[PDB]
Coordinates of C-alpha atoms and ligand atoms in Angstrom, one line a residue:
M7 CA 4.5 28.0 1.3
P8 CA 2.6 30.5 3.3
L9 CA -0.6 30.2 5.4
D10 CA -4.0 30.2 3.6
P11 CA -5.3 33.8 4.1
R12 CA -8.6 32.4 5.6
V13 CA -6.7 30.2 8.1
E14 CA -4.3 33.1 8.9
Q15 CA -7.3 35.2 10.0
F16 CA -8.8 32.4 12.1
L17 CA -5.5 32.1 14.0
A18 CA -5.2 35.8 14.2
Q19 CA -8.4 36.2 16.1
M20 CA -8.0 33.7 18.9
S29 CA -13.2 21.2 34.1
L30 CA -13.5 18.2 31.8
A31 CA -17.2 18.6 31.3
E32 CA -16.7 22.3 30.8
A33 CA -14.0 22.0 28.1
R34 CA -16.2 19.4 26.4
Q35 CA -19.2 21.7 26.1
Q36 CA -16.8 24.5 25.0
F37 CA -15.5 22.2 22.2
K38 CA -19.1 21.2 21.3
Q39 CA -20.1 24.9 21.4
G40 CA -17.1 25.7 19.0
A41 CA -18.2 23.0 16.5
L42 CA -21.9 24.0 16.4
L43 CA -20.9 27.7 15.9
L44 CA -19.1 26.6 12.7
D45 CA -22.1 24.5 11.6
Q46 CA -24.2 27.7 11.8
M47 CA -21.6 29.7 10.0
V48 CA -21.6 27.1 7.2
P49 CA -24.8 25.0 7.3
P50 CA -24.3 21.2 6.6
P51 CA -26.4 19.6 3.8
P52 CA -29.5 17.8 5.1
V53 CA -29.3 14.0 5.2
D54 CA -31.3 11.0 6.4
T55 CA -30.0 9.6 9.7
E56 CA -30.8 6.7 12.0
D57 CA -29.7 6.6 15.7
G58 CA -28.7 3.2 17.0
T59 CA -26.5 1.2 19.4
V60 CA -24.0 -1.6 18.8
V61 CA -23.3 -4.3 21.4
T62 CA -19.5 -4.3 21.8
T63 CA -17.2 -6.3 24.1
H64 CA -16.8 -3.1 26.2
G65 CA -20.5 -2.2 26.4
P66 CA -23.1 -0.4 24.2
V67 CA -21.7 2.2 21.7
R68 CA -24.1 4.7 20.2
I69 CA -23.9 5.2 16.4
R70 CA -25.6 7.2 13.6
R71 CA -26.1 5.7 10.2
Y72 CA -26.0 8.3 7.4
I73 CA -27.9 7.6 4.2
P74 CA -27.2 9.5 0.9
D75 CA -29.8 10.7 -1.6
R76 CA -28.1 8.6 -4.2
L77 CA -26.2 5.5 -3.1
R78 CA -23.2 5.1 -5.5
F79 CA -20.4 3.5 -3.4
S80 CA -20.6 -0.2 -2.7
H81 CA -19.1 -0.4 0.8
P82 CA -20.1 1.3 4.1
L83 CA -17.9 3.9 5.7
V84 CA -17.2 3.7 9.4
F85 CA -16.1 7.1 10.8
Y86 CA -14.3 7.5 14.1
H87 CA -14.3 11.2 15.1
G88 CA -11.3 13.2 16.4
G89 CA -11.0 15.2 19.6
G90 CA -7.8 13.8 21.1
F91 CA -9.6 10.8 22.6
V92 CA -11.2 13.1 25.2
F93 CA -13.5 15.4 23.2
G94 CA -16.0 15.0 20.3
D95 CA -19.2 13.1 19.7
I96 CA -21.4 12.3 16.8
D97 CA -22.8 15.8 16.8
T98 CA -19.4 17.5 16.8
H99 CA -18.6 15.7 13.5
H100 CA -22.0 15.9 11.9
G101 CA -20.7 18.5 9.5
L102 CA -18.0 16.3 8.0
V103 CA -19.9 13.0 8.0
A104 CA -23.0 14.7 6.4
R105 CA -20.8 15.9 3.5
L106 CA -18.9 12.6 3.2
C107 CA -22.2 10.9 2.9
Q108 CA -23.8 13.1 0.3
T109 CA -20.6 14.0 -1.7
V110 CA -19.4 10.4 -1.8
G111 CA -22.9 9.0 -2.0
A112 CA -22.2 6.3 0.6
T113 CA -23.6 5.0 3.9
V114 CA -21.6 6.3 6.9
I115 CA -21.9 4.9 10.5
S116 CA -20.5 7.6 12.7
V117 CA -19.3 5.9 15.9
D118 CA -19.9 7.4 19.4
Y119 CA -16.9 5.5 20.9
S120 CA -16.2 5.8 24.6
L121 CA -14.1 8.8 25.7
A122 CA -11.1 9.2 28.0
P123 CA -10.2 9.4 30.8
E124 CA -13.4 7.7 31.9
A125 CA -12.4 4.9 29.5
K126 CA -8.7 4.3 29.1
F127 CA -6.6 2.7 26.3
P128 CA -7.2 0.4 24.7
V129 CA -11.0 0.4 25.3
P130 CA -12.1 2.5 22.2
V131 CA -9.8 0.6 19.9
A132 CA -11.8 -2.5 20.9
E133 CA -15.1 -0.7 20.5
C134 CA -14.2 0.5 17.0
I135 CA -13.2 -3.0 15.8
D136 CA -16.5 -4.4 17.1
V137 CA -18.5 -1.8 15.3
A138 CA -16.5 -2.2 12.1
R139 CA -17.1 -6.0 12.4
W140 CA -20.8 -5.2 13.0
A141 CA -21.0 -3.1 9.8
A142 CA -19.3 -5.8 7.8
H143 CA -22.0 -8.2 8.9
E144 CA -24.8 -5.7 8.2
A145 CA -23.5 -4.6 4.8
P146 CA -25.2 -7.4 2.8
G147 CA -28.4 -6.5 4.5
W148 CA -28.2 -3.0 3.1
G149 CA -27.3 -4.2 -0.4
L150 CA -23.6 -3.6 -0.2
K151 CA -20.2 -5.5 -0.2
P152 CA -19.3 -6.9 3.2
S153 CA -16.0 -5.0 3.1
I154 CA -16.0 -1.6 4.8
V155 CA -14.0 1.6 4.7
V156 CA -12.7 2.9 8.1
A157 CA -12.2 6.6 8.3
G158 CA -11.3 9.2 10.9
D159 CA -9.7 12.6 11.7
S160 CA -6.8 13.0 14.1
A161 CA -7.5 10.8 17.2
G162 CA -10.1 9.1 14.9
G163 CA -7.5 8.8 12.2
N164 CA -5.4 6.9 14.8
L165 CA -8.3 4.5 15.4
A166 CA -8.9 4.0 11.7
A167 CA -5.2 3.2 11.3
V168 CA -5.2 0.7 14.2
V169 CA -8.4 -1.0 13.2
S170 CA -6.8 -1.5 9.8
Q171 CA -3.7 -3.1 11.2
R172 CA -5.7 -5.5 13.4
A173 CA -8.2 -6.2 10.6
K174 CA -6.6 -9.5 9.3
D175 CA -6.3 -11.1 12.8
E176 CA -9.8 -10.0 13.8
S177 CA -11.2 -11.5 10.5
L178 CA -12.6 -8.1 9.6
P179 CA -12.7 -7.2 5.8
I180 CA -11.5 -3.6 5.1
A181 CA -11.4 -2.3 1.6
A182 CA -9.8 1.0 2.4
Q183 CA -8.7 3.3 5.2
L184 CA -9.1 7.1 5.1
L185 CA -6.7 9.0 7.5
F186 CA -7.3 12.7 8.0
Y187 CA -4.3 14.3 9.7
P188 CA -3.9 11.3 12.1
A189 CA -1.8 10.7 15.1
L190 CA 0.4 7.6 14.5
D191 CA 3.6 7.9 16.6
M192 CA 3.5 8.9 20.3
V193 CA 7.1 7.8 20.7
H194 CA 9.1 9.9 18.2
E195 CA 9.6 13.6 18.0
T196 CA 9.5 14.8 14.3
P197 CA 10.5 18.1 12.6
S198 CA 6.8 19.2 12.1
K199 CA 5.9 18.2 15.7
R200 CA 8.7 20.2 17.3
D201 CA 8.4 23.0 14.6
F202 CA 4.6 23.5 15.0
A203 CA 4.3 22.7 18.7
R204 CA 2.6 26.0 19.6
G205 CA 0.2 28.4 17.8
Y206 CA -1.3 26.3 15.1
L207 CA -4.5 25.2 16.9
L208 CA -3.2 21.7 17.8
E209 CA -0.5 22.3 20.4
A210 CA 2.1 20.1 22.1
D211 CA 0.9 20.7 25.7
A212 CA -2.6 19.6 24.6
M213 CA -1.0 16.5 23.2
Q214 CA 0.9 15.6 26.3
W215 CA -2.3 16.0 28.3
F216 CA -4.5 14.0 25.9
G217 CA -1.9 11.2 26.3
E218 CA -2.3 11.3 30.1
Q219 CA -6.0 11.1 29.8
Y220 CA -5.9 8.2 27.3
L221 CA -3.0 6.0 28.4
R222 CA -2.8 3.8 31.5
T223 CA 1.0 4.3 31.9
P224 CA 3.7 6.0 29.8
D225 CA 4.9 2.7 28.4
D226 CA 1.7 2.5 26.3
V227 CA 3.3 4.9 23.9
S228 CA 5.4 2.2 22.2
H229 CA 2.4 -0.1 21.9
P230 CA 1.2 -0.6 18.2
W231 CA -2.5 -0.1 19.1
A232 CA -1.4 3.3 20.4
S233 CA 1.4 4.0 17.9
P234 CA 0.5 2.2 14.6
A235 CA 3.5 3.8 12.9
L236 CA 5.8 1.4 14.8
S237 CA 4.4 -1.8 13.3
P238 CA 7.4 -3.1 11.2
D239 CA 5.2 -5.0 8.6
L240 CA 2.6 -3.1 6.5
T241 CA 2.2 -5.6 3.6
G242 CA -1.4 -6.3 2.6
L243 CA -3.0 -3.5 4.6
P244 CA -6.1 -1.9 3.0
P245 CA -5.6 0.9 0.4
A246 CA -4.9 4.2 2.2
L247 CA -5.9 7.9 1.6
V248 CA -3.6 9.9 4.0
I249 CA -4.5 13.6 4.1
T250 CA -2.2 16.0 6.0
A251 CA -2.2 19.7 6.8
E252 CA 1.0 21.7 6.1
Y253 CA 1.4 23.5 9.3
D254 CA 0.5 20.7 11.7
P255 CA 2.6 18.9 14.4
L256 CA 1.2 15.5 13.2
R257 CA 2.0 16.2 9.5
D258 CA 5.4 14.4 9.4
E259 CA 4.3 11.1 11.1
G260 CA 1.3 11.1 8.8
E261 CA 3.4 11.5 5.6
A262 CA 6.2 9.0 6.6
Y263 CA 3.5 6.4 7.5
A264 CA 2.1 7.0 4.0
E265 CA 5.5 6.6 2.4
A266 CA 5.9 3.3 4.4
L267 CA 2.5 1.9 3.2
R268 CA 3.6 2.8 -0.3
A269 CA 6.9 0.9 0.2
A270 CA 5.0 -2.1 1.5
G271 CA 3.0 -2.3 -1.7
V272 CA -0.2 -0.7 -0.3
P273 CA -2.1 1.5 -2.8
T274 CA -1.6 4.9 -1.3
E275 CA -2.7 8.4 -2.1
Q276 CA -1.0 11.0 0.2
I277 CA -2.2 14.6 -0.1
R278 CA -0.9 17.7 1.8
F279 CA -3.2 20.7 1.8
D280 CA -0.7 23.6 1.6
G281 CA -1.2 26.5 4.0
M282 CA -3.7 24.6 6.2
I283 CA -3.7 23.6 9.8
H284 CA -4.8 20.6 11.9
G285 CA -8.6 20.0 12.1
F286 CA -9.4 21.7 8.9
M287 CA -11.8 18.9 7.7
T288 CA -14.2 19.7 10.5
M289 CA -13.7 23.5 9.9
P290 CA -16.0 24.3 6.9
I291 CA -15.2 28.0 6.9
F292 CA -12.2 26.8 4.8
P293 CA -12.8 25.8 1.2
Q294 CA -10.1 23.1 1.6
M295 CA -12.4 21.0 3.8
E296 CA -14.8 20.3 0.9
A297 CA -11.8 20.1 -1.5
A298 CA -10.6 17.1 0.7
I299 CA -14.1 15.6 0.8
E300 CA -13.8 15.7 -3.0
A301 CA -10.5 13.8 -2.7
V302 CA -12.2 11.1 -0.6
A303 CA -14.8 10.7 -3.3
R304 CA -12.3 10.4 -6.1
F305 CA -10.0 8.0 -4.3
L306 CA -13.0 5.8 -3.4
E307 CA -14.0 5.5 -7.1
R308 CA -10.7 3.8 -7.7
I309 CA -11.3 1.1 -5.2
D310 CA -13.5 -0.7 -7.7
Ligands
LIG1 C1 -11.7 17.8 15.6 C2 -10.4 17.1 15.4 C3 -9.2 17.8 16.0 C4 -9.0 17.7 17.5 C5 -7.6 17.7 18.1 C6 -7.5 18.7 19.3 C7 -7.6 20.2 18.9 C8 -7.1 16.3 18.4 O1 -6.3 15.7 17.3 C9 -5.3 14.9 17.5 O2 -4.8 14.2 16.6 C10 -4.6 14.9 18.9 C11 -4.5 16.2 19.4 C12 -4.0 16.4 20.7 C13 -3.5 15.3 21.4 C14 -3.6 14.1 20.9 C15 -4.1 13.8 19.6 C16 -4.1 12.4 19.2 O3 -5.0 11.9 18.6 O4 -3.0 11.7 19.7 C17 -1.8 12.4 19.9 C18 -1.1 11.8 21.2 C19 0.3 12.4 21.4 C20 1.0 12.0 22.7 C21 -1.9 12.0 22.5 C22 -2.7 10.8 23.0 C23 -1.7 9.7 23.5 C24 -2.4 8.4 23.8
LIG2 C1 8.5 11.9 3.6 C2 8.1 11.7 5.0 C3 8.1 12.9 5.9 C4 8.1 12.8 7.4 C5 9.3 13.3 8.2 C6 9.4 12.5 9.6 C7 10.1 11.2 9.5 C8 10.6 13.3 7.5 O1 10.9 14.6 6.9 C9 12.0 14.6 6.2 O2 12.7 13.7 6.0 C10 12.5 16.0 5.8 C11 13.7 16.4 6.2 C12 14.3 17.6 6.0 C13 13.6 18.5 5.2 C14 12.3 18.2 4.8 C15 11.7 17.0 5.0 C16 10.3 16.8 4.4 O3 9.5 16.0 4.9 O4 10.1 17.7 3.5 C17 8.7 18.2 3.4 C18 8.7 19.6 2.7 C19 8.0 19.5 1.4 C20 8.0 18.2 0.6 C21 8.1 20.6 3.7 C22 7.8 22.0 3.1 C23 6.6 22.8 3.7 C24 6.7 23.1 5.2

Protein backbone atom coordinates (compact mmCIF):
# COMPACT_ATOMS: atom_id res chain seq x y z
CA MET A 1 0.00 0.00 0.00
CA PRO A 2 2.34 2.80 -1.25
CA LEU A 3 3.32 6.14 0.28
CA ASP A 4 0.92 9.06 0.03
CA PRO A 5 2.40 11.21 -2.81
CA ARG A 6 2.50 14.31 -0.58
CA VAL A 7 4.38 12.43 2.16
CA GLU A 8 6.68 10.86 -0.45
CA GLN A 9 7.74 14.37 -1.54
CA PHE A 10 8.29 15.49 2.06
CA LEU A 11 10.65 12.56 2.64
CA ALA A 12 12.32 13.12 -0.72
CA GLN A 13 13.39 16.66 0.08
CA MET A 14 15.13 16.14 3.41
CA SER A 15 23.15 20.94 21.54
CA LEU A 16 19.91 20.19 23.40
CA ALA A 17 18.77 23.82 23.35
CA GLU A 18 19.79 24.02 19.70
CA ALA A 19 17.88 20.92 18.52
CA ARG A 20 14.84 22.18 20.48
CA GLN A 21 14.72 25.53 18.66
CA GLN A 22 15.33 23.66 15.41
CA PHE A 23 12.27 21.51 16.20
CA LYS A 24 10.24 24.58 17.28
CA GLN A 25 11.38 26.29 14.06
CA GLY A 26 10.24 23.26 12.02
CA ALA A 27 6.76 23.34 13.60
CA LEU A 28 6.16 27.08 13.13
CA LEU A 29 7.23 26.82 9.45
CA LEU A 30 4.35 24.36 8.91
CA ASP A 31 1.97 26.65 10.84
CA GLN A 32 2.79 29.39 8.28
CA MET A 33 2.51 26.96 5.38
CA VAL A 34 -0.95 25.99 6.66
CA PRO A 35 -2.37 28.63 9.06
CA PRO A 36 -4.29 27.26 12.10
CA PRO A 37 -7.88 28.42 12.75
CA PRO A 38 -8.05 31.28 15.30
CA VAL A 39 -9.26 30.26 18.77
CA ASP A 40 -9.74 31.80 22.24
CA THR A 41 -6.95 30.73 24.62
CA GLU A 42 -6.05 31.30 28.28
CA ASP A 43 -2.59 30.78 29.74
CA GLY A 44 -2.37 29.28 33.23
CA THR A 45 -0.40 27.13 35.69
CA VAL A 46 -1.40 23.99 37.63
CA VAL A 47 0.13 23.23 41.05
CA THR A 48 1.41 19.64 40.66
CA THR A 49 3.32 17.36 43.05
CA HIS A 50 6.45 17.93 40.95
CA GLY A 51 6.10 21.73 40.71
CA PRO A 52 4.12 24.24 38.57
CA VAL A 53 3.18 23.09 35.07
CA ARG A 54 2.11 25.69 32.48
CA ILE A 55 -1.10 25.00 30.53
CA ARG A 56 -3.22 26.58 27.81
CA ARG A 57 -7.01 26.21 27.83
CA TYR A 58 -8.56 26.27 24.35
CA ILE A 59 -12.17 27.42 24.05
CA PRO A 60 -14.26 26.61 20.93
CA ASP A 61 -16.68 28.97 19.18
CA ARG A 62 -19.48 26.49 19.83
CA LEU A 63 -19.14 24.14 22.79
CA ARG A 64 -20.70 20.80 21.79
CA PHE A 65 -18.75 18.13 23.73
CA SER A 66 -19.54 17.59 27.43
CA HIS A 67 -16.07 16.68 28.75
CA PRO A 68 -12.70 18.56 28.69
CA LEU A 69 -9.83 17.25 26.59
CA VAL A 70 -6.39 17.07 28.17
CA PHE A 71 -3.68 17.03 25.54
CA TYR A 72 -0.12 15.83 26.18
CA HIS A 73 2.15 16.81 23.28
CA GLY A 74 4.70 14.60 21.54
CA GLY A 75 8.39 15.25 20.91
CA GLY A 76 9.96 12.08 22.32
CA PHE A 77 9.87 13.38 25.95
CA VAL A 78 12.67 15.86 25.09
CA PHE A 79 11.12 18.25 22.53
CA GLY A 80 7.82 20.07 22.06
CA ASP A 81 5.86 22.65 23.97
CA ILE A 82 2.37 24.20 23.88
CA ASP A 83 3.37 26.30 20.85
CA THR A 84 4.71 23.34 18.87
CA HIS A 85 1.30 21.64 19.03
CA HIS A 86 -0.82 24.77 18.72
CA GLY A 87 -1.80 23.65 15.21
CA LEU A 88 -3.35 20.35 16.30
CA VAL A 89 -4.97 21.49 19.54
CA ALA A 90 -6.48 24.53 17.81
CA ARG A 91 -8.15 22.24 15.27
CA LEU A 92 -9.15 19.64 17.85
CA CYS A 93 -10.81 22.45 19.80
CA GLN A 94 -12.78 23.95 16.92
CA THR A 95 -13.49 20.81 14.84
CA VAL A 96 -14.62 18.85 17.92
CA GLY A 97 -16.13 21.90 19.65
CA ALA A 98 -14.53 21.04 23.01
CA THR A 99 -12.33 22.63 25.68
CA VAL A 100 -8.73 21.50 25.46
CA ILE A 101 -6.05 22.02 28.09
CA SER A 102 -2.71 21.66 26.36
CA VAL A 103 -0.17 20.66 29.00
CA ASP A 104 3.36 22.06 29.15
CA TYR A 105 4.74 19.02 31.00
CA SER A 106 8.38 18.99 32.18
CA LEU A 107 10.88 17.79 29.57
CA ALA A 108 13.82 15.37 29.69
CA PRO A 109 16.60 15.00 30.47
CA GLU A 110 16.27 17.94 32.91
CA ALA A 111 13.33 15.99 34.35
CA LYS A 112 13.60 12.18 34.33
CA PHE A 113 11.01 9.40 34.34
CA PRO A 114 8.55 9.26 35.90
CA VAL A 115 8.18 12.97 36.65
CA PRO A 116 5.97 13.98 33.63
CA VAL A 117 3.66 11.01 34.14
CA ALA A 118 3.02 12.45 37.61
CA GLU A 119 2.50 15.96 36.27
CA CYS A 120 0.04 14.73 33.65
CA ILE A 121 -2.07 12.90 36.23
CA ASP A 122 -2.16 15.94 38.53
CA VAL A 123 -3.33 18.13 35.64
CA ALA A 124 -5.96 15.61 34.54
CA ARG A 125 -7.14 15.43 38.18
CA TRP A 126 -7.15 19.25 38.19
CA ALA A 127 -9.31 19.36 35.07
CA ALA A 128 -11.75 16.80 36.44
CA HIS A 129 -12.22 19.10 39.45
CA GLU A 130 -12.56 22.23 37.29
CA ALA A 131 -14.94 20.67 34.76
CA PRO A 132 -18.22 21.38 36.69
CA GLY A 133 -17.07 24.98 37.04
CA TRP A 134 -17.04 25.27 33.23
CA GLY A 135 -20.45 23.59 32.85
CA LEU A 136 -19.14 20.15 31.87
CA LYS A 137 -19.07 16.54 33.13
CA PRO A 138 -16.27 15.87 35.70
CA SER A 139 -14.95 13.06 33.46
CA ILE A 140 -12.18 14.05 31.05
CA VAL A 141 -10.62 12.83 27.80
CA VAL A 142 -6.84 12.37 27.79
CA ALA A 143 -5.16 12.74 24.41
CA GLY A 144 -1.65 12.82 22.97
CA ASP A 145 0.64 12.15 20.02
CA SER A 146 3.66 9.81 20.18
CA ALA A 147 5.40 10.48 23.53
CA GLY A 148 2.19 12.32 24.48
CA GLY A 149 0.19 9.31 23.36
CA ASN A 150 2.34 7.31 25.79
CA LEU A 151 1.39 9.64 28.65
CA ALA A 152 -2.29 9.55 27.71
CA ALA A 153 -2.07 5.75 27.78
CA VAL A 154 -0.31 5.69 31.16
CA VAL A 155 -2.62 8.27 32.76
CA SER A 156 -5.56 6.07 31.69
CA GLN A 157 -4.05 2.93 33.25
CA ARG A 158 -3.43 4.71 36.58
CA ALA A 159 -6.77 6.50 36.47
CA LYS A 160 -8.73 4.08 38.69
CA ASP A 161 -6.16 3.97 41.51
CA GLU A 162 -5.64 7.74 41.36
CA SER A 163 -9.45 8.28 41.60
CA LEU A 164 -9.43 10.23 38.32
CA PRO A 165 -12.53 9.85 36.06
CA ILE A 166 -11.58 9.37 32.40
CA ALA A 167 -14.33 9.01 29.78
CA ALA A 168 -11.95 8.22 26.90
CA GLN A 169 -8.33 8.13 25.74
CA LEU A 170 -7.17 9.34 22.32
CA LEU A 171 -3.85 7.81 21.23
CA PHE A 172 -2.17 9.26 18.16
CA TYR A 173 0.63 6.94 16.94
CA PRO A 174 1.80 6.36 20.55
CA ALA A 175 4.87 4.68 22.01
CA LEU A 176 3.67 1.82 24.25
CA ASP A 177 6.40 -0.89 24.37
CA MET A 178 10.05 0.02 25.00
CA VAL A 179 10.94 -3.64 25.63
CA HIS A 180 9.82 -5.50 22.50
CA GLU A 181 11.07 -5.22 18.95
CA THR A 182 8.22 -5.49 16.43
CA PRO A 183 8.02 -5.98 12.63
CA SER A 184 7.13 -2.32 11.97
CA LYS A 185 9.83 -1.07 14.37
CA ARG A 186 12.66 -3.10 12.80
CA ASP A 187 11.17 -2.63 9.24
CA PHE A 188 10.77 1.19 9.48
CA ALA A 189 13.81 1.92 11.65
CA ARG A 190 15.44 4.43 9.27
CA GLY A 191 14.12 6.90 6.72
CA TYR A 192 10.51 7.47 7.79
CA LEU A 193 11.05 10.61 9.89
CA LEU A 194 10.95 8.81 13.24
CA GLU A 195 14.12 6.70 13.42
CA ALA A 196 15.48 4.01 15.73
CA ASP A 197 18.63 5.90 16.71
CA ALA A 198 16.44 8.84 17.75
CA MET A 199 14.38 6.44 19.85
CA GLN A 200 17.35 4.88 21.67
CA TRP A 201 18.54 8.41 22.45
CA PHE A 202 15.17 9.67 23.67
CA GLY A 203 15.06 6.69 26.03
CA GLU A 204 18.48 7.64 27.43
CA GLN A 205 17.31 11.21 28.07
CA TYR A 206 14.06 10.08 29.65
CA LEU A 207 14.86 6.99 31.71
CA ARG A 208 16.94 6.75 34.89
CA THR A 209 18.38 3.30 34.15
CA PRO A 210 17.73 0.76 31.33
CA ASP A 211 15.51 -1.33 33.62
CA ASP A 212 12.78 1.35 33.44
CA VAL A 213 11.86 -0.11 30.01
CA SER A 214 9.84 -2.94 31.56
CA HIS A 215 8.02 -0.58 33.95
CA PRO A 216 4.28 -0.15 33.06
CA TRP A 217 4.43 3.65 33.48
CA ALA A 218 7.06 3.56 30.72
CA SER A 219 5.68 0.59 28.72
CA PRO A 220 1.87 0.59 29.28
CA ALA A 221 1.61 -2.22 26.71
CA LEU A 222 2.95 -4.66 29.33
CA SER A 223 0.09 -4.27 31.84
CA PRO A 224 -1.58 -7.73 31.79
CA ASP A 225 -5.08 -6.48 32.72
CA LEU A 226 -6.86 -3.92 30.55
CA THR A 227 -10.46 -4.52 31.72
CA GLY A 228 -12.48 -1.37 32.40
CA LEU A 229 -10.04 1.14 30.91
CA PRO A 230 -11.66 4.19 29.20
CA PRO A 231 -12.86 3.86 25.55
CA ALA A 232 -9.92 4.22 23.16
CA LEU A 233 -9.33 5.85 19.81
CA VAL A 234 -5.98 4.45 18.61
CA ILE A 235 -4.74 6.08 15.37
CA THR A 236 -1.61 4.75 13.67
CA ALA A 237 0.44 5.63 10.59
CA GLU A 238 1.24 2.85 8.08
CA TYR A 239 4.98 3.38 7.62
CA ASP A 240 5.88 4.01 11.25
CA PRO A 241 8.13 2.02 13.68
CA LEU A 242 5.53 2.48 16.43
CA ARG A 243 2.66 1.26 14.26
CA ASP A 244 2.68 -2.36 15.43
CA GLU A 245 2.77 -1.81 19.21
CA GLY A 246 -0.04 0.75 18.74
CA GLU A 247 -2.27 -1.73 16.86
CA ALA A 248 -1.59 -4.73 19.12
CA TYR A 249 -2.37 -2.61 22.19
CA ALA A 250 -5.67 -1.65 20.47
CA GLU A 251 -6.44 -5.31 19.75
CA ALA A 252 -5.71 -6.01 23.43
CA LEU A 253 -8.06 -3.28 24.70
CA ARG A 254 -10.71 -4.74 22.39
CA ALA A 255 -10.15 -8.24 23.81
CA ALA A 256 -10.46 -6.74 27.32
CA GLY A 257 -13.94 -5.38 26.48
CA VAL A 258 -12.81 -1.77 26.11
CA PRO A 259 -14.75 0.13 23.37
CA THR A 260 -12.04 0.65 20.80
CA GLU A 261 -11.75 2.28 17.43
CA GLN A 262 -8.39 1.60 15.73
CA ILE A 263 -7.57 3.41 12.48
CA ARG A 264 -4.52 3.12 10.24
CA PHE A 265 -3.90 6.00 7.84
CA ASP A 266 -2.45 4.16 4.84
CA GLY A 267 0.60 5.71 3.17
CA MET A 268 1.28 8.04 6.13
CA ILE A 269 4.25 8.39 8.48
CA HIS A 270 4.75 9.13 12.17
CA GLY A 271 3.93 12.67 13.31
CA PHE A 272 1.37 13.33 10.60
CA MET A 273 -1.25 14.84 12.94
CA THR A 274 1.08 17.76 13.68
CA MET A 275 1.97 18.03 9.95
CA PRO A 276 -0.94 19.97 8.35
CA ILE A 277 0.55 19.90 4.83
CA PHE A 278 -1.03 16.43 4.69
CA PRO A 279 -4.85 16.22 4.25
CA GLN A 280 -4.81 13.15 6.49
CA MET A 281 -4.14 15.30 9.59
CA GLU A 282 -7.58 16.92 9.41
CA ALA A 283 -9.06 13.59 8.29
CA ALA A 284 -7.91 12.16 11.65
CA ILE A 285 -9.17 15.22 13.57
CA GLU A 286 -12.52 14.39 11.95
CA ALA A 287 -12.15 10.81 13.26
CA VAL A 288 -11.60 12.22 16.78
CA ALA A 289 -14.83 14.27 16.48
CA ARG A 290 -16.90 11.27 15.26
CA PHE A 291 -15.53 8.89 17.88
CA LEU A 292 -16.26 11.39 20.68
CA GLU A 293 -19.89 11.75 19.55
CA ARG A 294 -20.33 8.07 20.41
CA ILE A 295 -19.15 8.53 24.00
CA ASP A 296 -22.64 9.85 24.94
C1 LIG B 1 5.62 15.82 17.06
C2 LIG B 1 5.42 14.35 17.44
C3 LIG B 1 6.49 13.41 16.88
C4 LIG B 1 7.85 13.49 17.58
C5 LIG B 1 8.73 12.21 17.60
C6 LIG B 1 10.16 12.56 17.15
C7 LIG B 1 10.31 12.86 15.66
C8 LIG B 1 8.65 11.49 18.97
O1 LIG B 1 7.61 10.45 18.96
C9 LIG B 1 7.72 9.28 19.64
O2 LIG B 1 6.77 8.56 19.83
C10 LIG B 1 9.12 8.91 20.03
C11 LIG B 1 10.10 9.16 19.08
C12 LIG B 1 11.43 8.89 19.32
C13 LIG B 1 11.80 8.31 20.51
C14 LIG B 1 10.85 8.02 21.45
C15 LIG B 1 9.50 8.28 21.23
C16 LIG B 1 8.61 7.91 22.38
O3 LIG B 1 7.69 8.58 22.76
O4 LIG B 1 9.04 6.81 23.05
C17 LIG B 1 9.79 5.75 22.40
C18 LIG B 1 10.91 5.20 23.30
C19 LIG B 1 11.62 3.99 22.66
C20 LIG B 1 12.79 3.43 23.47
C21 LIG B 1 11.94 6.26 23.72
C22 LIG B 1 11.83 6.81 25.14
C23 LIG B 1 12.06 5.72 26.18
C24 LIG B 1 11.77 6.14 27.61
C1 LIG C 1 -2.81 -6.83 14.97
C2 LIG C 1 -1.66 -6.32 15.81
C3 LIG C 1 -0.45 -5.87 14.98
C4 LIG C 1 0.87 -5.69 15.74
C5 LIG C 1 2.09 -6.59 15.46
C6 LIG C 1 3.06 -6.62 16.66
C7 LIG C 1 2.72 -7.62 17.75
C8 LIG C 1 1.74 -7.99 14.98
O1 LIG C 1 1.72 -8.09 13.53
C9 LIG C 1 1.36 -9.28 13.05
O2 LIG C 1 0.96 -10.18 13.75
C10 LIG C 1 1.61 -9.43 11.57
C11 LIG C 1 2.43 -10.52 11.27
C12 LIG C 1 2.77 -10.83 9.97
C13 LIG C 1 2.26 -10.07 8.93
C14 LIG C 1 1.43 -9.00 9.20
C15 LIG C 1 1.07 -8.67 10.51
C16 LIG C 1 0.18 -7.46 10.62
O3 LIG C 1 0.11 -6.74 11.59
O4 LIG C 1 -0.36 -7.15 9.44
C17 LIG C 1 -0.60 -5.75 9.16
C18 LIG C 1 -0.75 -5.54 7.65
C19 LIG C 1 -2.17 -5.09 7.23
C20 LIG C 1 -3.30 -5.54 8.14
C21 LIG C 1 0.33 -4.59 7.12
C22 LIG C 1 0.22 -4.08 5.67
C23 LIG C 1 0.79 -2.70 5.34
C24 LIG C 1 2.26 -2.47 5.69
